[PDB]
Amino acid sequence: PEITISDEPDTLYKRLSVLVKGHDKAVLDSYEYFAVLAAKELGISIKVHEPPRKIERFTLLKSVHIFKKHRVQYEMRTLYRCLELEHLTGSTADVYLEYIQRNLPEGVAMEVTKTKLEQLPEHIRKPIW
Amino acid sequence: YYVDWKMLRDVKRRKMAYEYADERLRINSLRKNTILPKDLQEVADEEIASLPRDSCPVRIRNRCVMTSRPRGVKRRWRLSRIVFRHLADHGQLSGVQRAMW
Amino acid sequence: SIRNPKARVVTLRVKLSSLNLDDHAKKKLIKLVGDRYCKSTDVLTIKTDRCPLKRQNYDYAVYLLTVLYHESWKTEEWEKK
Amino acid sequence: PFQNGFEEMIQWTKEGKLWEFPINNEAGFDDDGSEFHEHIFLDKYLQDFPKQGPIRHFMELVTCGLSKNPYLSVKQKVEHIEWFRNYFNEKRVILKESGIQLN
Amino acid sequence: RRKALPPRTEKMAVDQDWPSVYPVAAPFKPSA
Amino acid sequence: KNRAARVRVSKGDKPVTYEEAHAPHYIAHRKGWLSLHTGNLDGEDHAAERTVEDVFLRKFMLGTFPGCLADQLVLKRRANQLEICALVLRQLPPHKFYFLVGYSETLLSHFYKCPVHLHLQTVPSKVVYKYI
Amino acid sequence: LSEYAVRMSRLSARLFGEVARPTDSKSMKVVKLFSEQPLAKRKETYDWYPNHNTYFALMGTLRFLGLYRDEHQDFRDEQLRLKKLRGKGKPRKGEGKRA
RNA sequence: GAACAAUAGUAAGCACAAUCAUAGCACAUAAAAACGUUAGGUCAAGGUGUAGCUUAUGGGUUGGAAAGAAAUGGGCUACA
Ligand SMILES: [Mg+2]
Ligand SMILES: [Mg+2]
Ligand SMILES: [Mg+2]
Ligand SMILES: [Mg+2]
Ligand SMILES: [Mg+2]
Ligand SMILES: [Mg+2]
Ligand SMILES: [Mg+2]
Ligand SMILES: [Mg+2]
Ligand SMILES: [Mg+2]
Ligand SMILES: [Mg+2]
Ligand SMILES: [Mg+2]
Ligand SMILES: [Mg+2]
Ligand SMILES: [Mg+2]
Ligand SMILES: [Mg+2]
């Protein structure tokens, strides 16, 4: 394993918001367990919650030719877990998330939002034009 | 082989429509403007009327990609109802369950 | 494909109270920006979409911030009108 | 030979077959090394055009359109404009005939 | 010529550490 | 009378796979999904492609591996790689099995332009869930 | 409505990069039009169908290279053989009608 | 081919029932509902057995259709 250190002042993250979409509630439970257990070992200080489930239903005809009295209806459920992490470094995020994503199960998707901390841009600091 | 002749026809209309897309766009821009002179717009009118009309967008028909059926297709899977159901009911379609509530 | 269109989008949250603004400059910037300013929480927001790459949207959002600040301090004729 | 599954993935990734982690969806697309002011600000390409004519109305519109357009490179945006230069310049006749003198 | 070899579960050491056996993402072989 | 993906009651002697014995209304209740991918979740794209793709791999595996296929073929998509699991009956002499492993992986990988992983679990005889 | 209001409006828009001078609801469609991806260009349209010739021909060759096995075309085959055998085949082009 | 103070019935299977879903109960609804019946529906979803077409019952381009004397099915809006 090769580590390098570059002089530049690595990025801070106030809040790292990680959403996992899924079909089966089980998979998202065990994955929560895994993520929390990874984070507890890396000193990451995290929370988790369950956002409201989405259920999308729609309707098809039940026969090939004609009985329109008769339909079938189908569903897709989308279940959510969100891991909300606070006060992370740049590298910390890169690694932790790398470990998360690498192990992402096949039935699930993940949506990451970082909120990054930057002091002030250079042309605004206290010049005025 | 595409499954039907109708499919060949519409494959080709897709390729056409990708071909001329920017001619269409550009020309139609003048044509849809109230700021330009009418004089420009008449000539341009003749110009989009000029280009082959198998290359026009609305002449395109989504079909079931496997089965070719012109109606009954569900946009997301680009499948006919019959084929879709057929798949979903062996369980070969992920995340689709028969809906109860 | 790893291409997801939704990724481009960048947001800026900036608290106006943390800003070096003149009285005149603050008020002019409020009127200037409009809805992107929340008058209750003082959070100026900028969403950027327009450009294919994330870095670009970052640059442009920074650009907008910069610009709005530079323009809020400039008094003009019609302002006195 | 492959000593382990980790070995496997490793060779895939060096090779370019596996993805990079953590994912940035813009990986592999550099967009020409362009920057935001090479998209948003289109003054460059409007330099040859009548400055007070309705032509400016129109082309300022097209400007705004292509300024807001994520799905195109700089080279294509340019091509649109140049197509309009070519187009308007090709018809001098119709410009003169509509009640405005156009350059 | 028919081949029946007993599963790895037969040679498995009761205390043998698991991640040795299943390091990465896997199909679930019932044999191993 | 729903004929959908169902297997009729015989004189009672007919061997039936656990999957073919569990009727469509049973998906997600007892039976699982034969494929897995992101595409049908709320905010997601390109579901169609993974469907065409899936279909073609059903036909492909049925055709490359004649008479030796046990139960329907289990596809998983993980981070751009395919994991194709199969229950395969033991008919072939093992050499041929590995020939076709290499053959399949390579061919598919170069077709779908993404790395494919193949797994054969070999079974002495079709598992019987019911009758027999 | 005021002039101050108007000048602020202009200022804001020309800043954020939206429409500059006052323009009709009609003409704005041009802006909307380039600002988008034209319908025919969307990958969700032109790439709609999988190339069918590719799958068909690839599995076809792969049949004769001995690798793939097509039960459908084998059924087809055997049937065609048994139809030509009984004495009804597919006429040499041009021969059938006039005779 | 049953009688339970029982008289020739036993039987795993598939149905019903039971459980699942409608985010905790319960009920309700949803779903499910075999064997057969109606030679019920559909060779225009697709696929096929038998037959036919092959300088054409095949493949393309350009136009053209979907008019109301009425008769009736279902809706919508009213009659305040
Ligand atoms: Mg249409
Ligand atoms: Mg019913
Ligand atoms: Mg319950
Ligand atoms: Mg009940
Ligand atoms: Mg019912
Ligand atoms: Mg029941
Ligand atoms: Mg009949
Ligand atoms: Mg009848
Ligand atoms: Mg037919
Ligand atoms: Mg036939
Ligand atoms: Mg004809
Ligand atoms: Mg016609
Ligand atoms: Mg009447
Ligand atoms: Mg009414």
Coordinates of N, CA and C in Angstrom, one line a residue, chain F residues 3-131:
Chain F
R3 N -53.8 -18.2 -16.9 CA -52.9 -19.1 -17.4 C -51.4 -18.6 -17.3
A4 N -51.3 -17.5 -16.6 CA -50.0 -16.8 -16.6 C -48.9 -17.6 -15.9
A5 N -47.8 -17.9 -16.7 CA -46.6 -18.5 -16.2 C -46.8 -19.7 -15.2
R6 N -47.8 -20.5 -15.4 CA -48.3 -21.4 -14.4 C -48.0 -22.8 -14.9
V7 N -48.0 -23.8 -14.0 CA -47.8 -25.2 -14.4 C -49.0 -26.0 -13.9
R8 N -49.7 -26.6 -14.8 CA -51.0 -27.3 -14.5 C -50.8 -28.5 -13.7
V9 N -51.8 -28.9 -12.9 CA -51.9 -30.1 -12.2 C -52.1 -31.3 -13.1
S10 N -51.2 -32.2 -13.0 CA -51.1 -33.4 -13.8 C -51.9 -34.5 -13.2
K11 N -51.7 -35.8 -13.6 CA -52.1 -36.9 -12.9 C -51.4 -37.0 -11.6
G12 N -50.5 -36.1 -11.3 CA -49.8 -36.0 -10.1 C -48.4 -36.5 -10.1
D13 N -47.9 -37.0 -11.3 CA -46.6 -37.5 -11.4 C -45.5 -36.6 -11.9
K14 N -45.9 -35.3 -12.2 CA -45.0 -34.4 -12.9 C -44.0 -33.7 -12.0
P15 N -42.7 -33.8 -12.2 CA -41.7 -33.2 -11.4 C -41.7 -31.7 -11.6
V16 N -41.6 -30.9 -10.5 CA -41.6 -29.5 -10.6 C -40.6 -28.7 -9.8
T17 N -39.7 -27.9 -10.5 CA -38.8 -27.0 -9.9 C -39.5 -26.0 -8.9
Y18 N -38.9 -25.6 -7.8 CA -39.4 -24.7 -6.9 C -40.0 -23.4 -7.5
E19 N -39.3 -23.0 -8.5 CA -39.7 -21.7 -9.2 C -41.0 -21.9 -10.0
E20 N -41.0 -23.0 -10.8 CA -42.2 -23.3 -11.7 C -43.4 -23.7 -10.9
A21 N -43.2 -24.0 -9.6 CA -44.3 -24.4 -8.8 C -44.9 -23.2 -8.0
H22 N -44.3 -22.0 -8.2 CA -44.9 -20.9 -7.5 C -45.3 -19.7 -8.4
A23 N -46.7 -19.6 -8.4 CA -47.4 -18.8 -9.4 C -47.2 -17.3 -9.3
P24 N -47.4 -16.5 -10.4 CA -47.1 -15.1 -10.5 C -47.5 -14.3 -9.3
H25 N -48.6 -14.5 -8.7 CA -49.0 -13.7 -7.6 C -48.1 -13.8 -6.4
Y26 N -47.2 -14.8 -6.5 CA -46.3 -15.2 -5.4 C -45.0 -14.4 -5.3
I27 N -44.6 -13.7 -6.4 CA -43.4 -13.0 -6.5 C -43.4 -12.0 -5.3
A28 N -42.2 -11.9 -4.7 CA -41.9 -11.0 -3.6 C -42.6 -11.4 -2.3
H29 N -43.4 -12.5 -2.4 CA -44.0 -13.1 -1.2 C -43.2 -14.3 -0.7
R30 N -43.1 -15.3 -1.6 CA -42.3 -16.5 -1.4 C -41.1 -16.5 -2.4
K31 N -41.5 -16.6 -3.6 CA -40.5 -16.5 -4.7 C -39.7 -15.2 -4.7
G32 N -38.5 -15.2 -5.3 CA -37.7 -14.0 -5.4 C -37.7 -13.5 -6.8
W33 N -36.9 -12.5 -7.1 CA -36.7 -12.0 -8.5 C -35.5 -12.7 -9.1
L34 N -35.7 -13.1 -10.4 CA -34.6 -13.8 -11.1 C -33.5 -12.9 -11.5
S35 N -33.7 -11.6 -11.6 CA -32.7 -10.6 -12.0 C -32.6 -9.6 -10.9
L36 N -31.5 -8.9 -10.9 CA -31.4 -7.7 -10.0 C -30.6 -6.6 -10.7
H37 N -31.2 -5.4 -10.8 CA -30.5 -4.3 -11.1 C -31.1 -3.0 -10.7
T38 N -30.4 -1.9 -10.7 CA -30.9 -0.7 -10.3 C -32.1 -0.1 -11.0
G39 N -32.2 -0.5 -12.3 CA -33.1 0.3 -13.2 C -34.6 0.6 -13.0
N40 N -35.2 -0.1 -12.1 CA -36.7 0.1 -11.8 C -37.0 0.9 -10.6
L41 N -36.0 1.3 -9.9 CA -36.1 2.2 -8.7 C -36.6 3.5 -9.1
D42 N -37.1 4.3 -8.2 CA -37.8 5.6 -8.5 C -37.1 6.5 -9.4
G43 N -35.8 6.9 -9.1 CA -35.1 8.0 -9.8 C -34.2 7.5 -11.0
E44 N -34.5 6.3 -11.5 CA -33.4 5.7 -12.3 C -33.6 5.5 -13.8
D45 N -32.5 5.3 -14.5 CA -32.4 5.4 -16.0 C -32.0 4.1 -16.6
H46 N -32.4 4.0 -17.9 CA -31.9 2.9 -18.7 C -32.4 1.5 -18.3
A47 N -33.6 1.5 -17.7 CA -34.2 0.2 -17.3 C -34.3 -0.7 -18.5
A48 N -34.6 -0.2 -19.6 CA -34.9 -0.9 -20.9 C -33.8 -1.7 -21.3
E49 N -32.6 -1.1 -21.2 CA -31.4 -1.7 -21.8 C -31.1 -3.0 -21.0
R50 N -31.2 -2.9 -19.7 CA -30.9 -4.1 -18.8 C -31.9 -5.2 -19.1
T51 N -33.1 -4.8 -19.6 CA -34.1 -5.8 -19.9 C -33.8 -6.5 -21.2
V52 N -33.5 -5.8 -22.3 CA -33.1 -6.4 -23.6 C -32.0 -7.3 -23.3
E53 N -31.0 -6.7 -22.6 CA -29.7 -7.4 -22.2 C -30.0 -8.7 -21.5
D54 N -30.8 -8.6 -20.4 CA -31.2 -9.8 -19.7 C -31.8 -10.9 -20.6
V55 N -32.8 -10.5 -21.4 CA -33.5 -11.4 -22.3 C -32.5 -12.2 -23.2
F56 N -31.6 -11.4 -23.8 CA -30.6 -12.0 -24.7 C -29.7 -12.9 -23.9
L57 N -29.4 -12.7 -22.7 CA -28.5 -13.6 -21.9 C -29.3 -14.9 -21.5
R58 N -30.6 -14.8 -21.3 CA -31.4 -16.0 -21.2 C -31.3 -16.9 -22.4
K59 N -31.6 -16.4 -23.6 CA -31.5 -17.1 -24.8 C -30.1 -17.6 -25.1
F60 N -29.1 -16.8 -24.9 CA -27.7 -17.1 -25.1 C -27.2 -18.3 -24.2
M61 N -27.5 -18.2 -22.9 CA -27.1 -19.4 -22.0 C -27.9 -20.6 -22.3
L62 N -29.2 -20.5 -22.7 CA -29.9 -21.7 -23.1 C -29.3 -22.3 -24.4
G63 N -28.7 -21.5 -25.2 CA -28.2 -22.0 -26.5 C -26.7 -22.5 -26.5
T64 N -25.9 -21.9 -25.6 CA -24.5 -22.2 -25.5 C -24.3 -23.5 -24.7
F65 N -25.3 -23.7 -23.8 CA -25.2 -24.8 -22.9 C -26.3 -25.8 -23.0
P66 N -26.3 -26.6 -24.1 CA -27.5 -27.4 -24.5 C -27.8 -28.5 -23.5
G67 N -29.1 -28.6 -23.1 CA -29.6 -29.8 -22.4 C -29.1 -29.9 -21.0
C68 N -28.1 -29.1 -20.7 CA -27.5 -29.1 -19.3 C -28.0 -28.0 -18.4
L69 N -28.9 -27.2 -18.8 CA -29.4 -26.1 -18.0 C -30.4 -26.6 -17.0
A70 N -30.3 -26.3 -15.7 CA -31.2 -26.9 -14.7 C -32.4 -26.0 -14.5
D71 N -32.2 -24.8 -13.8 CA -33.3 -23.9 -13.6 C -33.0 -22.5 -14.2
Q72 N -34.0 -21.7 -14.2 CA -33.9 -20.4 -14.9 C -32.7 -19.6 -14.3
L73 N -32.1 -18.8 -15.2 CA -30.8 -18.3 -15.0 C -30.7 -16.9 -14.2
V74 N -29.8 -16.9 -13.2 CA -29.9 -15.8 -12.2 C -28.9 -14.6 -12.5
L75 N -29.4 -13.5 -13.0 CA -28.5 -12.4 -13.3 C -28.5 -11.4 -12.2
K76 N -27.2 -10.9 -12.0 CA -27.1 -9.8 -11.1 C -26.2 -8.7 -11.7
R77 N -26.5 -7.5 -11.5 CA -25.6 -6.4 -12.1 C -25.1 -5.7 -10.9
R78 N -23.8 -5.6 -10.8 CA -23.1 -4.9 -9.7 C -22.0 -4.0 -10.3
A79 N -22.3 -2.7 -10.1 CA -21.3 -1.7 -10.4 C -20.6 -1.9 -11.8
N80 N -21.4 -2.1 -12.8 CA -21.0 -2.3 -14.2 C -20.5 -3.7 -14.6
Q81 N -20.3 -4.6 -13.6 CA -20.0 -6.0 -14.0 C -21.3 -6.8 -13.8
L82 N -21.4 -7.8 -14.7 CA -22.5 -8.8 -14.6 C -22.0 -10.0 -13.8
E83 N -22.9 -10.5 -12.9 CA -22.6 -11.8 -12.2 C -23.7 -12.7 -12.7
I84 N -23.4 -13.7 -13.5 CA -24.3 -14.6 -14.0 C -24.2 -15.9 -13.3
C85 N -25.2 -16.2 -12.5 CA -25.2 -17.5 -11.8 C -26.1 -18.5 -12.6
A86 N -25.7 -19.7 -12.7 CA -26.5 -20.8 -13.3 C -26.5 -22.0 -12.4
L87 N -27.7 -22.6 -12.3 CA -27.8 -24.0 -11.9 C -27.7 -24.8 -13.2
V88 N -26.6 -25.6 -13.2 CA -26.3 -26.5 -14.4 C -26.3 -27.9 -14.0
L89 N -27.0 -28.8 -14.8 CA -27.0 -30.2 -14.6 C -25.7 -30.8 -15.0
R90 N -25.3 -32.0 -14.4 CA -24.1 -32.6 -14.9 C -24.3 -33.6 -16.0
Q91 N -23.8 -33.2 -17.2 CA -24.0 -34.0 -18.4 C -22.6 -34.1 -19.0
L92 N -22.1 -32.9 -19.4 CA -20.8 -32.7 -19.9 C -19.6 -33.2 -19.1
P93 N -18.6 -33.7 -19.8 CA -17.3 -33.9 -19.1 C -16.6 -32.6 -18.9
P94 N -16.1 -32.3 -17.7 CA -15.7 -31.0 -17.1 C -14.8 -30.1 -18.1
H95 N -14.0 -30.7 -18.9 CA -13.2 -29.9 -19.9 C -14.1 -29.0 -20.7
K96 N -15.1 -29.6 -21.3 CA -16.1 -28.9 -22.1 C -16.8 -27.7 -21.3
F97 N -17.1 -28.0 -20.0 CA -17.6 -27.0 -19.1 C -16.7 -25.8 -19.0
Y98 N -15.4 -26.0 -18.8 CA -14.5 -24.8 -18.7 C -14.2 -24.2 -20.1
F99 N -14.2 -24.9 -21.2 CA -14.2 -24.4 -22.5 C -15.3 -23.4 -22.7
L100 N -16.5 -23.7 -22.3 CA -17.6 -22.9 -22.4 C -17.7 -21.7 -21.4
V101 N -17.1 -21.9 -20.3 CA -16.9 -20.8 -19.3 C -16.1 -19.7 -20.0
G102 N -14.9 -20.0 -20.4 CA -14.0 -19.1 -21.0 C -14.7 -18.4 -22.3
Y103 N -15.3 -19.3 -23.1 CA -16.0 -18.9 -24.3 C -17.0 -17.8 -24.0
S104 N -17.9 -18.1 -23.1 CA -19.0 -17.3 -22.7 C -18.5 -15.9 -22.1
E105 N -17.6 -16.0 -21.1 CA -17.2 -14.8 -20.4 C -16.6 -13.8 -21.4
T106 N -15.6 -14.4 -22.2 CA -14.9 -13.5 -23.2 C -16.0 -12.9 -24.2
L107 N -16.7 -13.8 -24.8 CA -17.7 -13.4 -25.9 C -18.6 -12.3 -25.4
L108 N -19.3 -12.5 -24.3 CA -20.2 -11.6 -23.7 C -19.5 -10.2 -23.3
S109 N -18.4 -10.3 -22.6 CA -17.6 -9.2 -22.2 C -17.4 -8.2 -23.3
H110 N -17.0 -8.8 -24.5 CA -16.7 -8.0 -25.6 C -18.0 -7.6 -26.4
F111 N -19.1 -8.3 -26.1 CA -20.4 -7.9 -26.7 C -21.0 -6.7 -25.9
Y112 N -21.1 -6.8 -24.6 CA -21.8 -5.8 -23.8 C -20.8 -4.7 -23.3
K113 N -19.5 -4.9 -23.7 CA -18.5 -3.9 -23.4 C -18.4 -3.7 -21.9
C114 N -18.7 -4.7 -21.1 CA -18.5 -4.6 -19.7 C -18.1 -6.0 -19.2
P115 N -17.3 -6.1 -18.1 CA -16.7 -7.3 -17.6 C -17.7 -8.3 -17.1
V116 N -17.7 -9.5 -17.5 CA -18.7 -10.5 -17.1 C -18.0 -11.6 -16.2
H117 N -18.8 -12.0 -15.2 CA -18.3 -13.0 -14.3 C -19.3 -14.1 -14.4
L118 N -18.8 -15.3 -14.5 CA -19.7 -16.5 -14.7 C -19.6 -17.5 -13.5
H119 N -20.7 -18.1 -13.1 CA -20.6 -19.1 -12.0 C -21.5 -20.3 -12.3
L120 N -20.9 -21.4 -12.4 CA -21.7 -22.7 -12.5 C -21.8 -23.4 -11.2
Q121 N -23.0 -23.6 -10.8 CA -23.2 -24.6 -9.7 C -23.9 -25.8 -10.3
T122 N -23.2 -26.9 -10.1 CA -23.5 -28.2 -10.7 C -24.4 -29.0 -9.8
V123 N -25.5 -29.6 -10.4 CA -26.4 -30.4 -9.6 C -26.7 -31.7 -10.3
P124 N -26.8 -32.8 -9.5 CA -26.9 -34.2 -10.0 C -28.2 -34.4 -10.8
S125 N -29.3 -33.8 -10.3 CA -30.6 -33.9 -11.0 C -31.4 -32.7 -10.6
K126 N -32.4 -32.4 -11.5 CA -33.2 -31.2 -11.3 C -33.9 -31.3 -9.9
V127 N -33.8 -30.3 -9.1 CA -34.4 -30.3 -7.8 C -35.9 -30.4 -7.9
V128 N -36.5 -31.3 -7.1 CA -37.9 -31.4 -7.2 C -38.6 -30.8 -6.0
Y129 N -39.4 -29.8 -6.2 CA -40.1 -29.2 -5.1 C -41.4 -29.9 -4.9
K130 N -42.1 -30.3 -5.9 CA -43.4 -30.9 -5.7 C -43.7 -32.1 -6.7
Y131 N -44.7 -32.9 -6.3 CA -45.1 -34.1 -6.9 C -43.9 -35.1 -6.9

